[PDB]
Design a protein around this ligand. Structure first.
Ligand SMILES: [Mg+2]
Ligand SMILES: [Mg+2]
Ligand SMILES: [Mg+2]
Ligand SMILES: [Mg+2]
Lengths: 286, 283
């Protein structure tokens, strides 16, 4: 599929979705991060509704990922709380997002230790109940999958308990496939990519990470994400992360090898991830 | 406790090791990547031995990591006959053994090698070597070195371990018990992962966290210098958790238009999106 970045970017949406459904990413993890900084810069914190402002951008981006062919999107939403709980509730009660789930035929699942960790209060109990009801009401949807992580960072103990019960009722240990399904609600393949923000770090997609998960870190908060940016990330994943023919130094020009060698020996301390702080804000050097 | 990067780079090693032992990283993951590219560029493929050349560099780096104050280093080594020759050297080579002793390193192995390695003699040998090396260095307690062999996905390992554990205890194991079970000894979550080239991470199951500082060098692992390592540590220790934390709520209007234009002018700046030059991916 000999294609240039610019060309990929100029391609019509439905053509990108098609490529994506053939070459992946099939599963993308995308935590909406830096929302606080985003709000203060792109909104009016004096009057604007933080909750709704955020919700709107979440829908816009989730829509964009799905229209580009991505089957499953994993999104950690919670890794003060009254407003943290109100935001979660909006994900299962807001009419605009519910319309979005229906229109795009999205099956919404939740993962994490939220049944235990959420406050044992009226507000906490409602959120938990809202989650279960949403998974049930959107269960007829089969076009896309959306997994929201709430306390979904350390699955060890959850997998241990799930496994013990499983073996008890089946007489044998669950396969990796069954374990994934037990934790997320449905089988999901290993993440093909994770789109982070700022400081290089990833989180909350337990059991789904592999050496094959392409990692990206945006400079600007997640809500600045545009279609062009997503397509540049997609192009890198599809055409560059596993570029073929694979390198065969054994047959590279002596001149090309020399430049390469000089580059490494001159900048042996060039490391992406090493940043600098300006006014309290961390910036990746490059 | 207020040191610029330039100052940190000029500190005596002993002072750096004292800062690391106090502020971390305590657990560092560092797979030695791009060694074949490194071998082709820095050695004479015609006469230098790949295994030896690589082992020397591996020893050199581990030494650097441990002398800088890092307590535990997790190093994924594999995930074919020559692959075993390299493993063999880890628990047999005269100089690396002297290393484990000199720097008092306790060596452990993790992953599903006991069931994935070739069901042969040479393979059965490796397994025994691993078990013996862990025993022979069990008195050392200054540093820990965990070698990952087929240590990519612990899902089924944890399931079977938990089911057996419930049978031998009548209770499910705690996270701590699961970690001890997979790695042999309890190990804290990784504080940093030092990668290479295309941004990706791997082989340190159950120990990743949002607090794990991720880094990706441009050049193969073996080009690492003391300066490179210190720049990673500095960033991790002083910048990744810098304080005071941002207060946009009280920032200057001028500064807001700065961050604002930066983010609006360059909407698509994404570290990880690279380019391939002559078949080589560059960030
Ligand atoms: Mg992020
Ligand atoms: Mg980050
Ligand atoms: Mg690496
Ligand atoms: Mg890599």
């Amino acid at each position: 599929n000999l294609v240039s970045e610019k060309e990929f970017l100029d391609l019509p949406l439905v053509s990108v979705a098609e490529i994506v459904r053939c070459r992946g990413p099939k599963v993308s993890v995308f935590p909406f991060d830096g929302t606080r900084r985003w709000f203060h810069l792109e909104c009016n914190p004096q009057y604007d509704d933080y909750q709704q402002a955020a919700l709107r951008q979440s829908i816009r981006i989730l829509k964009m990922l799905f229209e580009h062919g991505i089957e499953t999107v994993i999104s950690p939403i919670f890794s003060y709380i009254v407003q943290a709980l109100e935001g979660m509730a909006l994900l299962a009660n807001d009419e605009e997002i519910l319309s979005f789930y229906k229109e795009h035929e999205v099956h919404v699942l939740f993962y994490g230790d939220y049944k235990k960790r959420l406050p044992s209060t009226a507000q906490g109990a409602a959120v938990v109940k809202s989650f279960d009801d949403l998974t049930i009401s959107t269960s007829s949807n089969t076009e896309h999958r959306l997994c929201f992580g709430v306390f979904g960072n350390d699955a060890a103990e959850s997998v241990a308990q799930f496994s013990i019960s499983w073996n008890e009722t089946h007489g044998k240990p669950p396969t990796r496939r069954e374990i994934i399904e037990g934790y997320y609600g449905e089988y999901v393949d290993k993440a093909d990519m994770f789109i982070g923000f700022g400081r290089f770090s990833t989180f909350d997609f337990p059991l789904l990470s592999s050496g094959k998960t392409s990692l990206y870190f945006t400079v600007a908060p997640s809500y600045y994400m545009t279609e062009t940016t997503l397509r540049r990330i997609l192009y890198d994943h599809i055409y560059l992360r596993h570029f073929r023919p694979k390198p065969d130094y054994s047959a590279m020009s002596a001149d090309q090898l020399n430049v390469l060698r000089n580059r490494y020996r001159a900048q042996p301390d060039r490391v992406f991830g090493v940043g600098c702080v300006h006014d309290g804000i961390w910036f990746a050097e490059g």
